[PDB]
Design an enzyme around this catalytic site. Structure first.
Site, PDB file in Angstrom:
ATOM      1  N   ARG A 260       0.722  -1.178   0.043  1.00 23.53           N
ATOM      2  CA  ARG A 260      -0.035   0.077   0.078  1.00 23.53           C
ATOM      3  C   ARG A 260       1.138   1.144   0.076  1.00 23.53           C
ATOM      4  NH1 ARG A 260      -2.301  -0.718   4.580  1.00 23.53           N
ATOM      5  NH2 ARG A 260      -4.353  -1.174   4.212  1.00 23.53           N
TER       6      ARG A 260
ATOM      7  N   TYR B 145       1.202   5.777  -4.489  1.00 24.12           N
ATOM      8  CA  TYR B 145       1.151   5.436  -5.808  1.00 24.12           C
ATOM      9  C   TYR B 145      -0.143   4.602  -6.177  1.00 24.12           C
ATOM     10  CZ  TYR B 145       3.880   1.238  -4.068  1.00 24.12           C
ATOM     11  OH  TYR B 145       3.921   0.214  -3.188  1.00 24.12           O
TER      12      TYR B 145
ATOM     13  N   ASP C 207      12.754  10.914  -8.679  1.00 25.44           N
ATOM     14  CA  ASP C 207      12.705  10.198  -7.643  1.00 25.44           C
ATOM     15  C   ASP C 207      13.273   8.729  -7.342  1.00 25.44           C
ATOM     16  OD1 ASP C 207       9.332   8.618  -6.161  1.00 25.44           O
ATOM     17  OD2 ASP C 207      11.498   8.638  -5.309  1.00 25.44           O
TER      18      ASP C 207
END
Lengths: 261, 82, 313, 16
Positions: free
Chosen positions: C29, C32, C135
């Site tokens: 989870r 995204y 990122d």
């Protein structure tokens, strides 16, 4: 992905032979002749260009939207209304080219204003669509277009070649406008961008009386396909000479095969 | 995809240009330099053609015969040189 | 837009729930989306947040469609449901996440050597195709385990990845925040609106230091104070005045030899300026990898994996 | 799994 065209998805799958284009367009040709279909394609490309220009868009995004519109190559024209194909393709092109997502009311107002100010004769009524229709249509388009969202353009090769030649003021505007005009044809689906850029540069240099024989002599590339591209561009420019939007588009769109409810 | 020919490994105009549409990583391009104004005002992008870049002109006259003659001259001269 | 076209498309389409057991057994989870373990009726099936397609989903689809590499994740198929208007992606399953290795150890030197080498070559390949990841986190690096290919770290979760071939708008006009503050580069932290490709170099240097010390080097103006504390203040771009030796001691405190080959590379990876920062290609040329042990394609190199499999939520 | 000469050059990629 950029910098390697020969391994990208735009070249591996979305370069189609002219035989396939002729075969897949038979269903749309059962109601209209080749001339009417070609004129309709030119008219809708002009509509896309005007809609993009109204929203204060760049040229790369409009070119990407036009390439996305040129869906109809492998699918029937009566499947989805092109008047709704244009705004959704423009929206998707703006979304993918990192220009930002347009507003809902902004897009609807822009489309209605354009259709009512410069295309009223073609469409006597208003634009009867909402944003949900646009969203579902773009979702379908992204589904069935094999998720190929990166489109290469001849602009970068054209700038590279003109910088290599040296002249940048007398030749660049003509080459740019020729590249803008060549999107009316299907050359984008037929040939790699650099061949189109070379053909446009050759036309621009020949028109303005510049000795470019020595430049074209040294470069090593197939010299027969460029002649075909020149022929296609010349046919475009000759056939556009005696074509009027206002006099005919009403009649052609009167013969338009509309989708069933 | 065997029918289509690829110019990936064939340089075009080797003395001055490399592969036709393959773009290597140039070390002296405009996307790496950081001037004082570039950081503050962001990337400064100006239209490639001054004036109307979107506008396309078709009212200018074209002579297909002259273009065909020039292309024939170019191809004949290239054949003669090789 | 007529009924026959829709019914023909539905006939041609295949349902994701009719082919995969994606229900239950959620394995990840995050912001995204949701990642589940799935198999045909093992892959990682990812459902993206938000109805319809967003900027993150569009960038994801338009980027991993054309990128292929042994060190880069590659989706096998995508599903598009019209009932709820959301997007489903199907990557190959990656059992081990670098975050799990970091947490479990809180360590062979050849393992980190090869892992750094592989991430550097992957990011170099990514930079070759003229795209910015924007990122880099230890949770975004995944490792294959006990499969056809061992090790073979894969870069993924590049929703924020953007092409920088030619920017029509400044890169900071549409994304004020690009990465978590734990690994934000000083250049963008100083309010830079046009940043080069060297930010990912800073990120990989930071995470490499994290694996070197088995502890986050930067921990929490919130991070600017830590940045100034870890490696001093630059005494040799905007809001220069509005802001209002240490590295050697910091590395010594973690029982790392100040005079070694890894320390020089780590010091040269992190700089206050973009111009003097090394690029990806020069990183491999560093003789740090040359000294034994030499980097290996298999990070474990025959050792048994002690890290447990990813658990369900 | 030793590749002495391969350390200097990065892998080109999967290609086609």
């Amino acid at each position: 992905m950029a910098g390697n065209f020969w391994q990208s998805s735009h070249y591996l799958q979305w370069i189609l032979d002219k035989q396939d284009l002729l075969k897949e367009r038979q269903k749309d040709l059962k109601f209209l002749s080749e001339e009417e279909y070609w004129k309709l394609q030119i008219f809708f490309t002009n509509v896309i260009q005007a809609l993009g220009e109204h929203l204060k868009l760049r040229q790369q995004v409009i070119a990407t939207a036009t390439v996305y519109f040129k869906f109809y190559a492998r699918y029937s024209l009566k499947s989805i209304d092109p008047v709704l194909m244009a705004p959704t393709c423009v929206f998707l092109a703006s979304k993918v080219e990192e220009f930002g997502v347009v507003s809902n009311t902004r897009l609807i107002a822009a489309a209605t204003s354009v259709l009512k100010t410069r295309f009223s004769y073609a469409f006597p009524k208003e634009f009867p669509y909402r944003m949900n229709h646009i969203l579902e249509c773009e979702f379908y388009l992204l589904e069935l277009m094999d998720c190929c969202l990166i489109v290469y353009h001849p602009y970068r090769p054209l700038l590279q070649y003109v910088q290599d030649m040296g002249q940048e003021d007398m030749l660049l505007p003509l080459a740019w406008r020729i590249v803008n005009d060549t999107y009316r044809t299907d050359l984008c689906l037929l040939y790699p961008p650099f061949m189109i850029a070379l053909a446009c540069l050759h036309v621009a240099c020949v028109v303005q009386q510049k000795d470019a024989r020595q430049w074209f002599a040294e470069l090593s590339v197939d010299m027969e396909k460029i002649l075909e591209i020149i022929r296609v561009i010349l046919k475009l420019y000759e056939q556009w000479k005696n074509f009027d939007e206002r006099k005919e588009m009403a009649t052609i769109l009167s013969k338009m095969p509309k989708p069933k409810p | 995809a065997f029918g289509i020919l690829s110019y990936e490994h064939r340089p075009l105009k080797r003395p001055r240009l490399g592969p036709p549409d393959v773009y290597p990583q140039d070390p002296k391009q405009k996307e790496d330099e950081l001037t004082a104004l570039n950081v503050k005002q962001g990337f400064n992008n100006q239209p490639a053609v001054s004036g109307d870049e979107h506008g396309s002109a078709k009212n200018v006259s074209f002579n297909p015969a002259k273009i065909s003659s020039n292309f024939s001259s170019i191809i004949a001269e290239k054949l003669r040189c090789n | 837009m007529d009924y026959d076209f829709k019914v023909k498309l539905s006939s041609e389409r295949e349902r994701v729930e009719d082919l995969f057991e994606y229900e239950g057994c959620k394995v990840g989870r995050g912001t995204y989306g949701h990642v589940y373990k799935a198999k045909r009726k093992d892959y990682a099936l990812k459902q993206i947040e938000g109805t319809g397609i967003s900027m993150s989903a569009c960038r994801e689809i338009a980027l991993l469609r054309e990128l292929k590499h042994p060190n880069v994740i590659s989706l096998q198929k995508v599903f598009l449901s019209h009932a709820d208007r959301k997007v489903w992606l199907l990557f190959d399953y990656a059992e081990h996440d670098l975050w799990h290795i970091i947490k479990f150890h809180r360590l062979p030197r050849g393992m980190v050597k090869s892992l750094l080498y592989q991430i550097l070559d992957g990011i170099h390949y990514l930079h070759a195709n003229w795209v910015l990841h924007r990122d880099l986190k230890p949770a975004n690096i995944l490792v294959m385990g006990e499969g056809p290919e061992r090790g073979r770290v894969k870069i993924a979760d590049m929703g924020f990845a953007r092409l920088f071939n030619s920017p029509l708008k400044p890169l900071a006009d549409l994304d004020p925040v690009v990465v978590t503050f734990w690994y934000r580069a000083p250049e963008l932290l100083l309010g830079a609106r046009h940043y080069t490709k060297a930010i990912d170099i800073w990120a990989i240097g930071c995470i490499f230091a994290e694996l070197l010390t088995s502890e986050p080097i930067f921990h929490c103006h919130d991070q600017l104070d830590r940045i100034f504390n870890v490696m001093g203040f630059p005494a040799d771009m905007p809001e220069h005045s509005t802001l209002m030796c240490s590295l050697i001691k910091y590395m010594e405190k973690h029982k790392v030899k100040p005079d070694s080959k890894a320390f020089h590379l780590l010091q040269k990876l992190l700089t206050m300026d973009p111009i003097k920062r090394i690029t990806s290609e020069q990183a491999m040329q560093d003789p740090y990898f040359l000294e034994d042990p030499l980097p290996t394609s298999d990070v474990f190199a025959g050792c048994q994996i002690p890290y447990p499999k990813r658990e369900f939520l | 799994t030793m590749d002495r000469d391969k350390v200097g050059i990065p892998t080109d990629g999967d290609s086609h």
